[PDB]
Structure formats: structure tokens, C-alpha cells
Design an enzyme around this catalytic site. Sequence first.
Site, PDB file in Angstrom:
ATOM      1  N   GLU B 279      20.101  -4.358 -73.036  1.00 46.65           N
ATOM      2  CA  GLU B 279      20.043  -2.918 -73.254  1.00 46.65           C
ATOM      3  C   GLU B 279      21.354  -2.244 -72.869  1.00 46.65           C
ATOM      4  OE1 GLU B 279      17.842  -0.730 -70.430  1.00 46.65           O
ATOM      5  OE2 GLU B 279      17.319   0.911 -71.791  1.00 46.65           O
ATOM      6  N   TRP B 301      12.123  -0.576 -76.047  1.00 48.92           N
ATOM      7  CA  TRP B 301      12.239   0.647 -76.831  1.00 48.92           C
ATOM      8  C   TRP B 301      11.347   0.643 -78.068  1.00 48.92           C
ATOM      9  CZ3 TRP B 301      14.498   5.120 -75.474  1.00 48.92           C
ATOM     10  CH2 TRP B 301      15.425   5.102 -74.425  1.00 48.92           C
ATOM     11  N   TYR B 327      21.622   7.410 -75.391  1.00 49.34           N
ATOM     12  CA  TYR B 327      22.561   6.598 -74.628  1.00 49.34           C
ATOM     13  C   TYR B 327      23.381   5.723 -75.565  1.00 49.34           C
ATOM     14  CZ  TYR B 327      18.430   7.332 -71.581  1.00 49.34           C
ATOM     15  OH  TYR B 327      17.322   7.840 -70.939  1.00 49.34           O
ATOM     16  N   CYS B 387      17.092   9.904 -69.518  1.00 49.88           N
ATOM     17  CA  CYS B 387      16.543   9.882 -68.168  1.00 49.88           C
ATOM     18  C   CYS B 387      17.641   9.702 -67.126  1.00 49.88           C
ATOM     19  CB  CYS B 387      15.487   8.783 -68.042  1.00 49.88           C
ATOM     20  SG  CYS B 387      14.091   9.042 -69.139  1.00 49.88           S
ATOM     21  N   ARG B 408      16.976  12.419 -64.011  1.00 48.87           N
ATOM     22  CA  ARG B 408      16.076  13.570 -64.037  1.00 48.87           C
ATOM     23  C   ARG B 408      14.617  13.158 -63.901  1.00 48.87           C
ATOM     24  NH1 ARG B 408      12.877  13.742 -68.301  1.00 48.87           N
ATOM     25  NH2 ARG B 408      13.531  12.608 -70.183  1.00 48.87           N
ATOM     26  N   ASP B 411      10.443   6.695 -63.771  1.00 48.16           N
ATOM     27  CA  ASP B 411       9.259   5.842 -63.733  1.00 48.16           C
ATOM     28  C   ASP B 411       9.504   4.744 -62.704  1.00 48.16           C
ATOM     29  OD1 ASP B 411       7.082   4.222 -64.113  1.00 48.16           O
ATOM     30  OD2 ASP B 411       7.419   3.890 -66.255  1.00 48.16           O
TER      31      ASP B 411
HETATM   32  N1  LIG Z   1       7.520   6.261 -69.611  1.00 45.68           N
HETATM   33  C1  LIG Z   1       8.656   5.599 -70.021  1.00 45.68           C
HETATM   34  N2  LIG Z   1       9.258   5.813 -71.158  1.00 45.68           N
HETATM   35  C2  LIG Z   1      10.387   5.035 -71.370  1.00 45.68           C
HETATM   36  N3  LIG Z   1      11.191   5.069 -72.482  1.00 45.68           N
HETATM   37  C3  LIG Z   1      12.217   4.153 -72.333  1.00 45.68           C
HETATM   38  C4  LIG Z   1      12.069   3.536 -71.114  1.00 45.68           C
HETATM   39  C5  LIG Z   1      12.951   2.449 -70.554  1.00 45.68           C
HETATM   40  C6  LIG Z   1      12.044   1.247 -70.346  1.00 45.68           C
HETATM   41  C7  LIG Z   1      10.982   1.054 -71.252  1.00 45.68           C
HETATM   42  C8  LIG Z   1      10.096  -0.025 -71.103  1.00 45.68           C
HETATM   43  C9  LIG Z   1      10.266  -0.949 -70.051  1.00 45.68           C
HETATM   44  C10 LIG Z   1       9.285  -2.082 -69.960  1.00 45.68           C
HETATM   45  O1  LIG Z   1       8.125  -1.925 -70.335  1.00 45.68           O
HETATM   46  N4  LIG Z   1       9.712  -3.257 -69.487  1.00 45.68           N
HETATM   47  C11 LIG Z   1       8.816  -4.401 -69.376  1.00 45.68           C
HETATM   48  C12 LIG Z   1       9.026  -5.232 -68.120  1.00 45.68           C
HETATM   49  C13 LIG Z   1       8.771  -4.626 -66.870  1.00 45.68           C
HETATM   50  C14 LIG Z   1       8.949  -5.346 -65.675  1.00 45.68           C
HETATM   51  C15 LIG Z   1       9.383  -6.682 -65.725  1.00 45.68           C
HETATM   52  C16 LIG Z   1       9.639  -7.296 -66.968  1.00 45.68           C
HETATM   53  C17 LIG Z   1       9.468  -6.586 -68.183  1.00 45.68           C
HETATM   54  C18 LIG Z   1       9.750  -7.283 -69.496  1.00 45.68           C
HETATM   55  O2  LIG Z   1       8.628  -7.695 -70.152  1.00 45.68           O
HETATM   56  O3  LIG Z   1      10.878  -7.459 -69.953  1.00 45.68           O
HETATM   57  C19 LIG Z   1      11.337  -0.765 -69.139  1.00 45.68           C
HETATM   58  C20 LIG Z   1      12.222   0.329 -69.286  1.00 45.68           C
HETATM   59  C21 LIG Z   1      10.896   4.103 -70.507  1.00 45.68           C
HETATM   60  C22 LIG Z   1      10.173   3.901 -69.229  1.00 45.68           C
HETATM   61  O4  LIG Z   1      10.536   3.092 -68.378  1.00 45.68           O
HETATM   62  N5  LIG Z   1       9.082   4.672 -69.058  1.00 45.68           N
HETATM   63  O1  LIG Z   2      15.732   4.719 -68.088  1.00 47.04           O
HETATM   64  C1  LIG Z   2      14.649   5.265 -67.981  1.00 47.04           C
HETATM   65  N1  LIG Z   2      14.156   5.564 -66.764  1.00 47.04           N
HETATM   66  C2  LIG Z   2      12.959   6.167 -66.617  1.00 47.04           C
HETATM   67  O2  LIG Z   2      12.618   6.384 -65.468  1.00 47.04           O
HETATM   68  N2  LIG Z   2      12.207   6.496 -67.706  1.00 47.04           N
HETATM   69  C3  LIG Z   2      10.885   7.162 -67.707  1.00 47.04           C
HETATM   70  C4  LIG Z   2      10.757   8.383 -66.766  1.00 47.04           C
HETATM   71  C5  LIG Z   2       9.514   9.093 -67.342  1.00 47.04           C
HETATM   72  O3  LIG Z   2       8.330   8.602 -66.712  1.00 47.04           O
HETATM   73  C6  LIG Z   2       9.515   8.681 -68.830  1.00 47.04           C
HETATM   74  C7  LIG Z   2       9.531   9.889 -69.786  1.00 47.04           C
HETATM   75  O4  LIG Z   2      10.649  10.748 -69.557  1.00 47.04           O
HETATM   76  P1  LIG Z   2      10.154  12.287 -69.614  1.00 47.04           P
HETATM   77  O5  LIG Z   2      10.176  12.834 -68.242  1.00 47.04           O
HETATM   78  O6  LIG Z   2      11.134  13.159 -70.546  1.00 47.04           O
HETATM   79  O7  LIG Z   2       8.665  12.391 -70.209  1.00 47.04           O
HETATM   80  O8  LIG Z   2      10.657   7.790 -68.993  1.00 47.04           O
HETATM   81  C8  LIG Z   2      12.687   6.194 -68.952  1.00 47.04           C
HETATM   82  C9  LIG Z   2      13.881   5.598 -69.124  1.00 47.04           C
HETATM   83  F1  LIG Z   2      14.321   5.324 -70.373  1.00 47.04           F
END
Ligand SMILES: Nc1nc2[nH]cc(Cc3ccc(C(=O)NCc4ccccc4C(=O)O)cc3)c2c(=O)[nH]1
Ligand SMILES: O=c1[nH]c(=O)n([C@H]2C[C@H](O)[C@@H](COP(=O)(O)O)O2)cc1F
Lengths: 506, 506
Positions: B279, B301, B327, B387, B408, B411
Site C-alpha cells: 500500500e 481497499w 493518498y 485519515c 484525524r 481505527d
Molecule cells: N473503517 C475503515 N475504513 C478504512 N478505509 C481504508 C482503511 C485502511 C485499511 C483498510 C482495511 C484494513 C484491513 O482490513 N486489513 C486486514 C488485516 C488486519 C490485521 C491483520 C492482517 C490483515 C490482512 O488480512 O492483511 C486495514 C487498513 C480503513 C480502515 O482501517 N478502517
Molecule cells: O489509514 C487509515 N487509518 C484509519 O484509521 N482509518 C479509519 C478511521 C475511521 O474509523 C475510518 C473512516 O474514516 P472516517 O472518520 O472519515 O469515517 O477509517 C482509515 C484509514 F484508511
Amino acid sequence: EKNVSIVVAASVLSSGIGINGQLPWSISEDLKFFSKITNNKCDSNKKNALIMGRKTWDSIGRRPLKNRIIVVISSSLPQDEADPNVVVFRNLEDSIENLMNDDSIENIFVCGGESIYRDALKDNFVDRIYLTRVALEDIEFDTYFPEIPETFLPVYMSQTFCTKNISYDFMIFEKQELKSIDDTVDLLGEIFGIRKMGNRHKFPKEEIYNTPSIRFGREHYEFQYLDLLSRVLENGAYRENRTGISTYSIFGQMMRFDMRESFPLLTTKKVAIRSIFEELIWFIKGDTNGNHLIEKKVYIWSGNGSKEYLERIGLGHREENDLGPIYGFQWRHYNGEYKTMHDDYTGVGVDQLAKLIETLKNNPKDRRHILTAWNPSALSQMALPPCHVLSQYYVTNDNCLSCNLYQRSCDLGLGSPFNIASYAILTMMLAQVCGYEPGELAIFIGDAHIYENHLTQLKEQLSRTPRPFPQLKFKRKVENIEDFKWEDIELIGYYPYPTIKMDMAV
Amino acid sequence: EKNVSIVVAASVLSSGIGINGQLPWSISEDLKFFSKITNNKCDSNKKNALIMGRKTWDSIGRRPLKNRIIVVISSSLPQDEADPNVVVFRNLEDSIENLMNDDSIENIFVCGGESIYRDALKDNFVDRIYLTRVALEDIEFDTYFPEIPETFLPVYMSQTFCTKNISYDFMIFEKQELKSIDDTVDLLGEIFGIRKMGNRHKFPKEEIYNTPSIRFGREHYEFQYLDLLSRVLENGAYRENRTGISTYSIFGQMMRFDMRESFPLLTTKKVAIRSIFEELIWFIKGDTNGNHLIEKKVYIWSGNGSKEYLERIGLGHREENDLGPIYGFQWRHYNGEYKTMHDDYTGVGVDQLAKLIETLKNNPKDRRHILTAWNPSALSQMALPPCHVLSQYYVTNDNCLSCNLYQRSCDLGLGSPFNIASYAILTMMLAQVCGYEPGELAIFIGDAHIYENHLTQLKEQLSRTPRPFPQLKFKRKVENIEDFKWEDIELIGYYPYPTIKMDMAV
Ligand SMILES: Nc1nc2[nH]cc(Cc3ccc(C(=O)NCc4ccccc4C(=O)O)cc3)c2c(=O)[nH]1
Ligand SMILES: O=c1[nH]c(=O)n([C@H]2C[C@H](O)[C@@H](COP(=O)(O)O)O2)cc1F
Ligand SMILES: NC(=O)C1=CN([C@@H]2O[C@H](COP(=O)(O)OP(=O)(O)OC[C@H]3O[C@@H](n4cnc5c(N)ncnc54)[C@H](OP(=O)(O)O)[C@@H]3O)[C@@H](O)[C@H]2O)C=CC1
Ligand SMILES: NC(=O)C1=CN([C@@H]2O[C@H](COP(=O)(O)OP(=O)(O)OC[C@H]3O[C@@H](n4cnc5c(N)ncnc54)[C@H](OP(=O)(O)O)[C@@H]3O)[C@@H](O)[C@H]2O)C=CC1
Ligand SMILES: CN(Cc1cnc2nc(N)nc(N)c2n1)c1ccc(C(=O)N[C@@H](CCC(=O)O)C(=O)O)cc1
Ligand SMILES: CN(Cc1cnc2nc(N)nc(N)c2n1)c1ccc(C(=O)N[C@@H](CCC(=O)O)C(=O)O)cc1
Ligand SMILES: Nc1nc2[nH]cc(Cc3ccc(C(=O)NCc4ccccc4C(=O)O)cc3)c2c(=O)[nH]1
Ligand SMILES: O=c1[nH]c(=O)n([C@H]2C[C@H](O)[C@@H](COP(=O)(O)O)O2)cc1F
């Protein structure tokens, strides 16, 4: 041999405690403190003794205090035995008989008036002092709390609270009479030099630590600013910058400030609150004309907006005080094509401040309440890139508005006290326009530094024990955020130490 | 009755301490620790006794240790009296005679082999354990340190150090057998409710505090993440958001991580390091095509780039995985007019990443090394606003590259472990291209939250005591930052707890 503590509420400067046989104020929470601190006991089969003079015994209506034994010092009162919760002694020294015997008394509290306070310290009976500093000074007193002797040292200072727009503190003074973990960390610090990250974040030495005796009770949020000064004096690397004045710098710091019960305006130095406001409303109005601040006798942007400075950085064709697209132009017209400071920009650009206000009251739990000033497209046109770069806002479940700010560069001597108060006012303005209450203020700092010509001044400021934060209230409710005027702001109870002159680096 | 402490260096998982009569590693700083911890005394007229078995006595060449008395446990060695610094006892129990008399011995250290360790704990003689956890496990051992009995609790865990690309920790285990300030703060917390800011930042309860026995020694920087989880479970407000999954949220937090002697990849959960890298290089290359991640089996994603999600947020005409300007598009083409993910953007926009690299090595002490992704003009076109919003970089006087990031929305279950490692790798990449070493990583968080479907998982993760951070090294020196490949990264000594599954909220 048990503990003897003084409980007193005195004004912040003159230490006044009474007037015409009564208190010069009415703070309900302070009485609850007096109640809970005097009832604080360890044995359920014991009571605490409250020593007080006769005139104070009259002040409380000559009625007993629940679950406690009142000891009245008087030369005329009858040594009555009908009331078992009230006993009379002829002098303060004899009344300390609660030490010699009477094992049913656990703790002793000196609650009396000036006469009882004065010769409780002169007789050296007092172990601890519970002081409630009240921010009221321009009234009349006839009874004062004596000066605290040098044998006492402060060990606690609470946050500033507010009651009826009156600020007050809670302090504890005490009279001066695991090791295996500390040793292991020291030994690892001798092996690894700066490889151990703790050695790059060394705790400040006592000689540069403000009010060093307060170790575990640095609750007052002005310490969030004073301790950052200490950390820079301790770990700051000597570095050169774009100005001729080098700084001592560290990277990655933060400060927290409460805005619910106080206003974070520093008390260890008199801060020019009017110049801070006139700059903030200057940002809000979308203005980049540096003359409008000079016309209002605010000269903070004179150095970065002179003909000699602009020609040196490559903006010779720019007008004298035309600072270009900066704070308040990215706020109200982001990405707007900049011409001069005289042109009309109504309609052009993205109005972040308006969209921020509309979003705060239409979707409060949204996680995108962001106001930014870092525009890579407009950086070249700016007289100086933004220091407070990006700020986020947050609505709590109890309808309070908190603020976070990231600051890329922080002049801890001049800009930082301004930045703390400026973004505090901005959060309060946004709170009133959106129908919320002020919350918390957090400032995340990148390059926190101290200019080398501020060393004598900032060390002087570190020698001053902080006083409770003042209050800031608005006189009227505006309809639009741009309508705020300096006459609308009331600064209640601000008693700072004398001002300290520090020159700005151009 | 003096102190008896075990000093031992054992592997992180299997607790191996020896192989073929010698140590399975060669860590110089660990020997200096052994020297300084065994020479640590309070009386200059006393020495410390080092008890060891015969085979360990052979391992050190049968030569005395300076300023110390070695006690060898052996059934065959002659009880020689020629050497006054070496004495032989027939069993471990008799050698504890140093307690009964011999007032010239201050402290006692058990340094021996597996045999001496096992029945020093079985005989219940040990008060303290100095453990050096070494991150080496895929080698062979023939001598092990016994399992620490439940009567011991950890009280200290240092940061992760590095020697020859080997990570190791320092821990202290101890055997389990002012009040006026704490009370005054408690009483003020009963008077004022949430008006006292401390009550909005309550210390986490023991049941949600990772490894609670470590109170004053939380040096390992993974606690910066684990303690943030605890603070959210303690003070997090239940709030609804744009997703159907509500969170527990707090505002304004921060985490520090060292990058000089370790790589901040969490050990309490196996983190997908490959998806983090793929990523990040996806960001660096300026790519917003979500299929390029799916083609490399990275599906993080997919949720925010589906036909149903894009149509729901108002981008129905957007292609399946066309995430829009996000990004890496604000990184490489800031303010560039976005069309689709297939068009050519070489030349359009502001290339922040290039200007950042050029500024980092041409003007290191500059205070403007800033990379932003918050573009108010492009927010509507994005599949999801940034984020990790803004990051600043800093060159130390000893040529290290530190990083600050403002986030900002965080998660804490999924994004935060990714964000910590991602910006660590990016800082290391920028360091190699600019000719520096990795420095520190600080993350300042706005909305730190925990999704309610992650509660069981995160509490499970909180039950795992952290292990030393791994190492991350690059195999070759690239010429351009875009040339990094997954094969170029070597992850040395990563022994995490099993992975924990957590579903992402769309
Ligand atoms: N709510 C919300 N929306 C978001 N949009 C984009 C992101 C970035 C992101 C989106 C998804 C993940 C994710 O599921 N990884 C899976 C995983 C977790 C732990 C160990 C291994 C693995 C793996 O299987 O590789 C991580 C990061 C994001 C977010 O984190 N939360
Ligand atoms: O790099 C990241 N880090 C992160 O913490 N989020 C999570 C934070 C939040 O729980 C979710 C949605 O963002 P928003 O606050 O705009 O709903 O994405 C997403 C990413 F891509
Ligand atoms: N802000 C605060 O925390 C407090 C404020 N106050 C205020 O202070 C004022 C009262 O204080 P103050 O005017 O000094 O009066 P006091 O409370 O000190 O009472 C004085 C009386 O105590 C007796 N007394 C004092 N010293 C001696 C002695 N050495 N030997 C024998 N008897 C002695 C005398 O009683 P007698 O004449 O009968 O012999 C004297 O008149 C009030 O306004 C009160 O409200 C009071 C307590 C706390
Ligand atoms: N990583 C670390 O911190 C350390 C690692 N090591 C490693 O461990 C290995 C050595 O340990 P290990 O194999 O267990 O051997 P030991 O060091 O424990 O020595 C064993 C000897 O001690 C004597 N002994 C043990 N128990 C008794 C008893 N109950 N009564 C009388 N004598 C006793 C015996 O000597 P005898 O036969 O003469 O009677 C026995 O042979 C080496 O590889 C060494 O490098 C050692 C110390 C520390
Ligand atoms: C006049 N006087 C002296 C007085 C007033 N304020 C103080 N404030 C402080 N911080 N310290 C003192 N020693 C002190 N003393 C008073 C007045 C009222 C009560 C009183 O009524 N106390 C009740 C409390 C009433 C309530 O809880 O509000 C109690 O239970 O102790 C005590 C002393
Ligand atoms: C084989 N052995 C046992 C050994 C090795 N590593 C350990 N490591 C740890 N953390 N704890 C132990 N008990 C330990 N014991 C050794 C080997 C060398 C020395 C030694 O030479 N110590 C010197 C230190 C040498 C130096 O300063 O580098 C000293 O003065 O104490 C001690 C014990
Ligand atoms: N290096 C550098 N460049 C910058 N550009 C813009 C600023 C903001 C600023 C610029 C100037 C000032 C300033 O002199 N106040 C004077 C003062 C200081 C203490 C008490 C009272 C008063 C008073 O107002 O009487 C404050 C803030 C800034 C900076 O602070 N440092
Ligand atoms: O609000 C401000 N706060 C502040 O601390 N500065 C100082 C920080 C630094 O001393 C200088 C900017 O120098 P540079 O642009 O090189 O980081 O301005 C300026 C402001 F406008």
C-alpha cells in the site's frame, strides 16, 4: 502525635480571607471541599477536631458541624460541657491537648481566623496547608491569611475551576522536615548512549523545572506550557535556521488545556490579549492586508511584512504590508487565485470556515471537521508559510466543542502563548455560533524551539509559580462569526506576573 | 537476610540460554548489563556473590570476575582456598549461608545454568529476576531457562535494542509477598463531576490494562499503542458514525515510537507486513487504481472501492475500483484535476514527495518538510477522505530522520497498526534516499476510537504481554524511492502472537 492541617481560602495576591465578619465571596464548591477534607478520616470510631477562633465560631452561627468536634479558642466563652461536639479552650497551645491524649481524635484541622492562623504557624504546629486561591483582588478585606513561611513547599496545584465567573485553585503545602527499577534504567542508559530513546528525552533538571517541589501534583494546565520550556532547555539541540538567531529545538511535543472551567491565558507573564483577538478576527474575516492590523495598533506582522523583508525573500513587486495568501485566505478562499490584498474575492475559493460551521451543527459526530492552511500551490506567494498548519474539531456527547491543532514550528517565547490563546478563542467563537460549550484544547507541535536571545527571559518566567487561569466570557450572542468585536470580550480575573519583553526573529 | 536475584538471558519464545557449553549469541551490550547489575552495590566495603554451576564456571574460563566473589556449585571441584575470589560449595542450599553470616556480602546473584536456575526457583530462594529476552528462535538450544513461576510478576520492560540485527529486551520480575495528594484529587473529583478534566481522562481500570503489574516501567513503546486501547475502553464515548457500526471514541491522543534500535511492528498480533508495504509503494508511485492492490492480493481497499459503496456515496459513474484523488495523488499531483485512474498525470499537480526529498538533503534544518493530503477542493471526488492527513519530517543534528503524523480518524483495531508501520517504513525509505538514519515516529490522533465489533478481539490482544520489536532492513540501496520492492525488505526477528481477525466497517 497526629497530623495538623490548616484549611483556608485566601485571595490570589493579597491573601484576604474575610471582611466584616464574613467571607468576601460565596463559592459553594469550596465549602464542599472544606466539608470533605475535614471529614476525611481513616477510623470510623474517631472524629476530627476543627480548631477555630471565636469570631469564626460566630461566623458559622455557633452551630456544630456534623460528624466533627469543633474546638473554639476564646478567653470569654464559657467552657460549656452540655454540647459534646463543641469544646472551648483558653488558648491555642492548650487546645493541642488532642495530641497529648484523646485517642478518639484522629486528625486536627486549624480552620480559624487570622489570629488563629498567625500563631499556629508561629508556634510551629502546622504540618500541612490546604489553600484555596481565589481570583478576587479589587475588593475590600479586613482579615488576611499570613504569609506562608519558607519551611513549607507546595506539593500540589489543581486545575482552575469556575464558579459564578470566579476562578480558583486548590493547593497543598507541606513542611519540610522502586529503587531497583530506577537503577536498571540508569545502568541501561550508561551502556546505550543516545541509542536509548529515554536519553534523548531526559527529564528536566531541577534548576530549570518550574516550582520543582510539586512532583506528583502538576495538575494546573499552565504546567503543560512551562514543562515544555523545561524540556527544551534540557534536550534542545543547538540549531541554525533562516534567521540570524539560532534556537534550541526538539521535535514532537504536545500540550493539553481545559476550556470548560478556565481560559488558557498564561499567568506567569502578562499576555497581550487584545493583539491576539485582533489577529484572530483578522483571520476569520479573510483578510491578508497587514495595514488593517497596524491601523488597530497591532504590530506583530510588521517584521514579516516590510519592504526589506519582502524583497529579500523574492516578493519585491508585492506592496508594503501585502502578506499574500496566508491564514484567513486559505480559511475563506482555499485554492483561490491570489492577486493583491485590495481585490474582491467574494465567491472564489473554498470557504472552509463556513463549511466547518455548517458541518459542526448539521453533522456533529462527523470525523472530518478539519480546517487547513497548508497549500503547496500558494506557498511561494506567502510572506511566511503557515505555522499553525491544520486544526480539527470535535463535538462531545455533552455538546462541548474540543479542538486539536498541529503546529509545524513553535516559537515558545512569543508565538506559543499567542497560539494557545488564539485557538482557545476560536473554539469558543465556533462553540457559540454552533450552540455548544467550550471543551478542550490540544496542541501538537513539530519543531518546538527557543530562540537563544529568549534564554534569560524564559528562565525568569520559569521562576514564577503559576496562578489560576482567568475567565473569558462573551457579552452578546452574535449571529455570524465575523461580527465579533473586542468590546464583546470580557476577561474576568486575570492577575498575571509582570510582562517580559522578547524580540521577534525576522 | 539480603536480596537474591537471578540474572539470565533467554530466547523470547522457548527460553533457550545455551548450546554446546556456550551462549547461542554474542551480544556485547548484554554482557555490560550483566557486569553493571552484578557490581551494583551500596557499601564500598562489601562485595556481591555470584552463584553459578560448574559448567558455567567452565564457560567463563575458570577466571574470577573483578570486584566480585564467584560461588561455584560442584560436587567434584576441590574446595580450594588459594583463590579468595572463588569459593566452592557442594550444593546450592549450603551456599545460601551468605545470608546467615558473612556480612561482607551485600547482594547475591544467581547466574548459573539450567540446573542452578531450576532449583533456585524450586527451593524458593529468588526474590528478583533480571531477564534479557533475545529475539532468536530458529536455532538450536540444549539448555533452557525454566518457566517463571506464577509467584513472580513483571515490573519493568525496556525498549527494544539492537545488536547485529538482533532485537532484545530487558525485563525485571519481582516476587509478590503521597496519600494526601491522592485523597485531595479524589475529593475534588467527587465535588466536580465531568467539570474536572481528570475525570474525562480516567486512568484505565486494571481489567483493561495490559500487563498491569508493570506500573512504573512501561518503557517498551508497544505500550504506547496498548495503553491507547485501554484509555479508549475506559473513557470512550459511544457514538454513531457514517457506518452502521458505532464506536467508543476519545479526542486528542498521541503515540511515540523509536526507530533507531527497532521497527514498531506490533507483537501482540501478527500484522500483515506485506500489505502495509504494497500500500505504501502504491502511495509513493502516485497510484489510485485499486485493482493494482487486488492483483497483488491486497484487499484492504476493496470495501471503499466497490460498485455499491461508490454509488452510495455519490460516485456511481466512477469505475469499480477507481478511488479518485487520494493518498499518492495529493502526494505526487497536488491540486491536479482528476479524471480517471487510467489517464496520464505526469507533469500535472505539485509533486510534494519530490520537493520533500530535495528539501530534506539540501536544507535539512528547514522547518517546512511537510507532506499533506488534505485538499478541500478534491474531498468530494475521493472515495474516502484522508485519515493520515498531514506529516512533518525533521533532521536531527546526528543525521537521523524523525517523523510526525496527524491522523484525524484512527481505527485502533485495523488502521492504527497499519499506520504505525506504514509511516515507519516511509521514514526509513526517505532516510536512505536522503542519506540519513531512521529517527523517531510520533503520531498525533484526533478521533481515536474502537469499533464495537472489535471489543472481544482487542480485549484478547490486551491479554498478551508484548515481545521485543523486530528489525527491518533494506537489502539494497535504491536510487529513486519508487524503486523499492517487497523483496528488498528483510524482516528480522519477528515473533508475534497469533493473528486476530477483525472486520472492516464500510
Ligand atoms: N473503517 C475503515 N475504513 C478504512 N478505509 C481504508 C482503511 C485502511 C485499511 C483498510 C482495511 C484494513 C484491513 O482490513 N486489513 C486486514 C488485516 C488486519 C490485521 C491483520 C492482517 C490483515 C490482512 O488480512 O492483511 C486495514 C487498513 C480503513 C480502515 O482501517 N478502517
Ligand atoms: O489509514 C487509515 N487509518 C484509519 O484509521 N482509518 C479509519 C478511521 C475511521 O474509523 C475510518 C473512516 O474514516 P472516517 O472518520 O472519515 O469515517 O477509517 C482509515 C484509514 F484508511
Ligand atoms: N476564608 C477563610 O477560609 C476563613 C475566613 N474567616 C474570616 O475571617 C474573619 C474572622 O477572623 P478573625 O477576625 O481573625 O477572628 P478569629 O476567627 O481569629 O477569632 C478571634 C478570637 O479568638 C480568640 N483568640 C484569638 N487568639 C487568642 C489567644 N492568643 N488567646 C486566647 N484567645 C484568642 C479571641 O476570642 P475572645 O475575644 O473571646 O477572647 C478572639 O477574639 C471572619 O471574617 C471570617 O469569616 C474565618 C475562617 C476562615
Ligand atoms: N544465557 C545465560 O544467561 C546463561 C547461559 N548459560 C549456558 O548454560 C550452559 C550451562 O548450563 P548447564 O548445562 O545447566 O550446567 P550448569 O552451569 O548448571 O552446571 C552444572 C553443574 O553444577 C553442579 N551441580 C548442579 N546441580 C547440583 C547439585 N544439586 N548439587 C551439587 N552440584 C550440582 C554440577 O557440577 P559437578 O558435575 O561438578 O558436580 C553440575 O554438573 C552453557 O551453555 C552456558 O553457556 C549459563 C549461564 C547463563
Ligand atoms: C465561615 N466558615 C469558615 C470557612 C469558610 N470557607 C473556608 N474555605 C476553605 N477553603 N477553608 C476554610 N477553613 C474555610 N473556612 C465556614 C462556613 C460554613 C461552613 C460549613 O457549613 N461547612 C459544611 C459544609 C456545607 C456544604 O457542604 O456546602 C460542612 O459540612 O463542613 C464551614 C465553615
Ligand atoms: C558465560 N557467562 C554466563 C552469562 C552470559 N550472559 C549472561 N547474560 C545475562 N543477561 N545474564 C546472565 N546471567 C548471563 N550469564 C558469562 C560470560 C561472560 C561474563 C563476563 O565476562 N562479565 C564481565 C563483563 C565483560 C564486559 O564488560 O563486556 C564482567 O565484568 O562482569 C559473565 C558471564
Ligand atoms: N519567528 C517568528 N515569526 C513570526 N511570524 C508571526 C509570528 C506571530 C507573532 C509575532 C510577534 C509577536 C510579538 O512580538 N508579540 C509581542 C508580545 C510578546 C509577549 C507579550 C506581549 C507582547 C505584546 O503584544 O505587547 C507574537 C506572535 C511570529 C513569531 O512569533 N515568531
Ligand atoms: O503563529 C505562529 N506561531 C509561531 O510559533 N511562529 C514562529 C515559529 C518560528 O519561530 C517562525 C517560523 O519560522 P519558520 O517558517 O522557518 O519555521 O514563526 C509563527 C507564527 F505565525
